[PDB]
């Protein structure tokens, strides 16, 4: 397994409501000047019993 209680939920439904959440344009992304301004999300999957 991964470390317990690591995984967060999705703020995608949450952050889409507030306009005051910081966004990125197509010229912003892949720059580290805005990679820290956006939300950081790290999924883990090493404990998944998946269909295979």
């Amino acid at each position: 397994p991964p470390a317990p209680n690591r995984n967060p939920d999705f703020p995608l439904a949450g952050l889409a409501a507030n306009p005051q959440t910081p966004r990125c344009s197509a010229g912003q992304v892949t720059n580290p000047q805005f990679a820290d301004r956006l939300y950081r999300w790290q999924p883990d999957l090493r404990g998944r019993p998946t269909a295979r």
């Binding site: 990125c24 344009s25 010229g27 912003q28 000047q33 805005f34």
Partner: protein, 49 residues
């Protein structure tokens, strides 16, 4: 004034805006007396009177 620069600095970061006064970034000041008066002063301490 600084009002041309003050209305401008609220623009976005993802569209660049570079203003260099005398090759230096603008620094702002409220007022100037006879005592300070900084006539041959270098890098851009600007005033807003």
């Amino acid at each position: 004034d600084c009002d041309a620069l003050m209305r401008r600095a609220a623009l976005d970061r993802h569209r660049d805006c570079r203003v260099s006064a005398g090759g230096h970034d603008p620094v702002y000041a409220a007022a100037c007396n006879v005592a300070t008066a900084d006539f041959n002063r270098n890098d851009g301490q600007l005033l807003h009177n």
